[PDB]
Each structure stands twice: as C-alpha cells, then as structure tokens.
Amino acid sequence: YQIKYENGIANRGCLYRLKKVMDRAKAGEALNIAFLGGSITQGSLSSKPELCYAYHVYEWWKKTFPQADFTYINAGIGGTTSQFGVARAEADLLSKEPDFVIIEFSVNDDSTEHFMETYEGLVRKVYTSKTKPAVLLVHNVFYNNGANAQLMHGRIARHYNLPAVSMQSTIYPEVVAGRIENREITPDDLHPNDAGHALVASVITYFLDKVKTESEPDYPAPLTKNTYEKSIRHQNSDENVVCHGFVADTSAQRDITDCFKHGWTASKKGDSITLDVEGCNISVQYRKSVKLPAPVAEIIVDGDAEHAVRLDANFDETWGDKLELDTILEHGENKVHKVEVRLTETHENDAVPFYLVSVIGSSEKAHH
C-alpha cells in the first residue's frame, strides 16, 4: 500500500499554538503531551500500552526534541463521548496542565447536532483553559462502512481554526480499495491493532513533521447554543444528595478507566437517591452490565414521574460493560433541578447492583 498522507490534513487551521510548543521544546522546557478520547485513545486494541497511537505520538515528541522532557497524559476512556469529555476535562486533563491536546471522539460521538454541541463545549473549554494548549483534532473511522462523526467535528475544526487529521481520508481509502485487508490493521473494524495503531500515529506525525519544517485568530462566538461548555458531574462527594436505599461506593479508583467509581449502588426495588443539579441540561451516567440480569431504574426530573426515563442496566451488547450517558433534559430552563433515581425492576439472580456513576448539569458559558 501507499497512504496519501497529504489527504490526512482535514484542516490546516492556525499553527501558532502548536509551533509555540515546538519552540518551547527547542528551548528545553518541560512539556505535557495529552490525549482525550475514547477506546482507541486509551489504547485498545494494542498488545502493550507503549504500542498504541498515543504513545507513538508521545515518542515522536521525545525523539524530535531530545533537549526537552515530555510527560505522557492518556485521558482516554473506552465507549465514551465528547459529552463525558467536557464534564471530566477539568479533572482528567486540564488539571495536569496540558501543552499539546489531541481530541479523539469521531467514532464515539454520533454524527448529530447534539454531539456537534457537546464537542463544541469540549473544544471551547480546552482551548481557553489556563495553559492555552495546542489542540489537534483526530478523526478515526469505522473500517466496516467508512463512517465517522467527522461531518459534525469538522465544522467545529474550521470554526476555531484547529488543525485536524483524519483516518477516514487516508487509511479507509486503502482498505475499501482492497490494498489493505481489514484484519491486517483491526480485528473488529473499529479498534486498531499494533500495526493499525502505528499507522494511525504515522498519519498524525506526518502532519507534525510538516509543521516542524515550516498571532492566533480572534476567538469566535459559538456556532451552536453551546450549552454543555459548563458541565458539572455530581458524584458521591456532592452535598445536596439524599440517599434512600442507594449507598455511596467508597472504594478506591485505580485510574480513570476504572470508571464505575465515586458513585452509588442499589439492589432493592424502590431504592432511590435525590440530587440537586444546576443547568438547562441534565444527563445521567450509569453501568450497562454484560453480566445479566441486572436492575432497571428510572430517572425523574422536577417530580415529573409521568415522563420518567428508563435506565436499563441490562446491556443488549456483548463486548463488555458500558459507561452509559443519557441526555434526559436538553435546553430546559437553567436552574437547580430536582433529580431522582429509583430502582423499578430487580431480579433474585441479578449478577451486579445498579451503578449510578454521575448526574451531569450543564449550561452555556457566556461568550464575550
């Protein structure tokens, strides 16, 4: 095969920030190389952490700039979207003072206006954060059908003049034309293997090399309503929570990928919990279990039980446990909402309790 590497540049965008980081590296300054994304970012399905695309991109920094000391920050969580991204950014990413940030959610986000709005939220938050990090957008692709959410994420790239590289216009063209058999690079047509992770990294480092061998724009108003830029996770540390059957999980979290932590568990019908959550948007995080059967809960917003949403922890997929996030209220009134979660169905043979991870309250941050 030969990849057309130039087809990787989905957007050139403004290189001011990224070149400024390269200049700091040349000056021997310590730099923080971060990655925020889904399963591919975390490192699925590499044989070792060191062979995932993120670590490859990190080694590119090390090798190209030996005079600088680089820190690797992998904030990937499998089976999660930019909606979770924007809520966890502060804890998992911005609190480690990133200088380079790759955002990788283009095969986790659906290509819908909802995720254009959450992705914008995420992008605005990260770009205007304290360390003013260089942001590169990375668009993976589904190798079964050539799909991604790049239509929605691209619009945001061009809006903020962010660089963006895509595997949809580099790797997938090779695969669809027969020049690459799928199983050489991915066992399941989504997650790269060792070869695939090296290939994905190579499309990124091509761009990075191009930048090296070669002041930032006005900050635009948001393209969308942008009502997720301020996303607050309410977990088992929040006061204002009153448990009625739900008990807080006090167990220690090994890393961010140990994602059923800092929340609450319940086992008995009628077990409930109430939260005060401020925002115009309300979303809820819970476990969908591969181990069946499991409880079913409903979530009620502002006492409106007639229009409650079913949270079924009986996963209908078989790959593993999912950290689900459902949007329950969107573009409501911005205020403190009452949120209740209660178990509506249980089974004598339930293999796991219901795990409520978080409830997220979201609203816009004012543009100036």
Ligand X SMILES: OC[C@H]1O[C@@H](O[C@H]2[C@H](O)[C@H](O)[C@H](O[C@H]3[C@H](O)[C@H](O)[C@H](O[C@H]4[C@H](O)[C@H](O)[C@H](O)O[C@@H]4CO)O[C@@H]3CO)O[C@@H]2CO)[C@@H](O)[C@@H](O)[C@@H]1O
Q: Name the residues that contact ligand X, by CB under 6 A.
A: 38-39, 42, 44-45, 78-79, 108, 188, 190-191, 317, 319-320
Nearer to ligand X, 141 or 277 (CB): 141
Q: Strands across the sheet with 272-279, in order?
A: 242-244, 272-279, 335-345, 296-301, 309-312
Q: Which is nearer to ligand X, 39 or 169 (CB)?
A: 39
The Cβ of residue 254 has, within 10 Å, a number of other Cβ atoms equal to 8
Minimum Å gap between C-beta 166 and ligand X is 17
Supply the minimum distance, in Å, between the C-beta of residue 106 and ligand X.
10
Rounded to 5°, the CA angle 125-130-135 comes to 55
Rounded CA-CA distance 93/85 in Å is 9
CB of residue 317 to ligand X, shortest distance in Å? 6
Pick 174 or 188: Cβ nearer ligand X? 188
- Considering the complex, state which of residue 291 and residue 331 has its C-beta at the smaller distance from ligand X: 291
The Cα–Cα gap between 138 and 8 comes to: 10
CB 149 within 8 A of CB 106: yes
Strand ranges for 15-99 from DSSP E: 31-37, 70-74
Is the Cβ of residue 190 or residue 300 nearer to ligand X in the bound state? 190
We find the least distance from the C-beta atom of residue 9 to ligand X, in angstroms, to be 25
For ligand X, the nearest residue by Cβ is: 78
Classified as helix, coil or strand, 261 is coil
Separation of alpha carbons 200 and 54, rounded Å? 9
Minimum gap (Å) between residue 137 Cβ and ligand X: 18
